Write an enzyme that holds these catalytic residues in place. Sequence first.
Site, PDB file in Angstrom:
ATOM      1  N   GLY A   1       0.947  -1.519   6.512  1.00 21.95           N
ATOM      2  CA  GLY A   1       1.287  -2.956   6.653  1.00 21.95           C
ATOM      3  C   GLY A   1       0.275  -3.988   6.141  1.00 21.95           C
TER       4      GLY A   1
ATOM      5  N   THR B   1       0.799  -1.233   0.000  1.00 23.58           N
ATOM      6  CA  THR B   1       0.000   0.000   0.000  1.00 23.58           C
ATOM      7  C   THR B   1       0.845   1.304   0.000  1.00 23.58           C
ATOM      8  OG1 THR B   1      -1.589  -1.366   1.152  1.00 23.58           O
ATOM      9  CG2 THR B   1      -1.986   1.032   1.135  1.00 23.58           C
TER      10      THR B   1
ATOM     11  N   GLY C   1      -2.993  -5.677   5.653  1.00 25.51           N
ATOM     12  CA  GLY C   1      -4.312  -5.032   5.616  1.00 25.51           C
ATOM     13  C   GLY C   1      -5.315  -5.458   6.672  1.00 25.51           C
TER      14      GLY C   1
ATOM     15  N   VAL D   1     -11.362  -7.176  -0.211  1.00 21.50           N
ATOM     16  CA  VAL D   1     -11.103  -5.762   0.110  1.00 21.50           C
ATOM     17  C   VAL D   1     -10.162  -5.648   1.314  1.00 21.50           C
ATOM     18  CG1 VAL D   1     -12.109  -3.578   0.813  1.00 21.50           C
ATOM     19  CG2 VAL D   1     -13.346  -5.037  -0.823  1.00 21.50           C
ATOM     20  N   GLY D   2      -9.218  -4.717   1.244  1.00 21.85           N
ATOM     21  CA  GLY D   2      -8.272  -4.515   2.325  1.00 21.85           C
ATOM     22  C   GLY D   2      -8.590  -3.284   3.170  1.00 21.85           C
ATOM     23  N   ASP D   3      -7.549  -2.807   3.847  1.00 23.62           N
ATOM     24  CA  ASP D   3      -7.654  -1.654   4.759  1.00 23.62           C
ATOM     25  C   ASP D   3      -7.892  -0.311   4.030  1.00 23.62           C
ATOM     26  OD1 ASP D   3      -4.916  -2.332   3.933  1.00 23.62           O
ATOM     27  OD2 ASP D   3      -4.227  -0.615   5.083  1.00 23.62           O
TER      28      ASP D   3
END
EC number: 3.4.19.5
Lengths: 297, 297
Positions: free
Chosen positions: B209, B157, B211, B186-188
């Site tokens: 870092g 990211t 997610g 889906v991540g952070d």
Amino acid sequence: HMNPIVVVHGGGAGPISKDRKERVHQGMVRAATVGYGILREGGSAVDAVEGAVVALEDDPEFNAGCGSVLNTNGEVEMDASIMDGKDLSAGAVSAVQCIANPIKLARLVMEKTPHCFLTDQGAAQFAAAMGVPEIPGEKLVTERNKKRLEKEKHLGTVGAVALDCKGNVAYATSVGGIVNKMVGRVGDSPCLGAGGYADNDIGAVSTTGHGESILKVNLARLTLFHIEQGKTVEEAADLSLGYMKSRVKGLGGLIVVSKTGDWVAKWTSTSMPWAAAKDGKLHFGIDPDDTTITDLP
Amino acid sequence: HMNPIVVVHGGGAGPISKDRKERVHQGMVRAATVGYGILREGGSAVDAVEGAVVALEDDPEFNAGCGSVLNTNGEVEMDASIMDGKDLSAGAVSAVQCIANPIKLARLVMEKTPHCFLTDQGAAQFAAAMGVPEIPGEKLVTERNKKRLEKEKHLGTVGAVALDCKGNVAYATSVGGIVNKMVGRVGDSPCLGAGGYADNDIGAVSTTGHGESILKVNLARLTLFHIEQGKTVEEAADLSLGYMKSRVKGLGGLIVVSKTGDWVAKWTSTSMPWAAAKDGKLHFGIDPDDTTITDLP
Ligand code: NA
Ligand code: NA
């Protein structure tokens, strides 16, 4: 060990009709009955909040699952999430169509994938593969919601919290969105720290109301911050909800239970159906002050 | 008025070869200088964070926009988010495909819809409504990407935080997924409070870092709770990163800029490429205590 506790919520939104009032009652009651039935038989917090939220999803009087609204393109699109206070294990799904219980799918995300959040296309695959029934998107679409769709062209988040016999906490929340919404809008309900948060070191929260505002201020997590700062459950509810109103002109509600079994339901919207089962006794209401405390059979 | 600053980061990840550090250190410099240039012409913090991230999106080396790592179908899905610290307005996309600049779409969700978050096929259908060009995915893919996934069938990211001369703070993030990530994972990044958070009354953070760990601890909003409580920004980052460590065994990193204008880049990962611009100087690193400082044209 702790006396279990379950609180359950529907929409943090406008006035309710006196007709829908009693029926709103029966779905909250059934909801909270079920969560508490699960806990008094050794089920966990996650177990409780999941069965609680499944109940409101199945019920067409509430806007999650069946009884979900239709987006601007004539289809239901759902969001849900769930979280273990023990390790902060969580699962979340967004813009899922054509399945009966998104909170269940949310649970599988958590417990059977190395991920927390799945969306739209990949969610449904994950579903498809975990054996979850597909159903014609007809049977998730009721009579009275296509009407308000039309009506608006020219019913908020439901949820649950618990503290179980062994001191674990959890939340779960699920919704069908706002009516005639644009394709693929995602509110607070699958976003950790907004639609809900759970942490065995503090408590569990589920939120309802304006998704966008709840998102902007991270409402659930914020409520728990005030609690960490040593404020009572009510004071923290008040402070968080107050901030949302003052900082982004947003309204809603929240249920919370601290790791000590303290709980409150609070709202800034006109109304928020809620119920709490603790000590074999049921607490229920819709309007501020309207509450009753009955005997659980 | 305040002296303005931009800080960027690449992904908080494992050890990086000499052969990439050079391409990455340059990339980090370009992003900072793009956003600083915007700050130099008195632009908004939100303009600047968008610009830097666009640069990183457009740099094939970074796991964002062009060069995004590949999912299970060998395909490109990306997430993004932006937040404007003045009124907490935000914009976000998850699991988007065949667009060059996810972060520019998130800004289009901020400004041009009632909402804060669009996903997948909605996000696709909006990108059209705004004439964002459907761009081929083999342009997004690289023979790092192609060559990585093929054998993974057996970096990270990016972001920026900015403080403009009005005292306004903002964050942006982007990421192109995970090698062999489940479709629709889906991540952070699109999750406000997780991947980033921006408020003028504290500051802004963009995290990077792992997610799920980030989501689970709401790392970006966590960091800000600590500044709210008296910690310095370096203390704040140290504790929020350490909590994600002890509690969820997760590594990562973040950048933060305060409403006072104090700034930092901190990580529990091995590396985290980063760059900053403040008072005529450009500050940089990748691995710990190795800050290269030079003038800016
Ligand atoms: Na329902
Ligand atoms: Na890139």
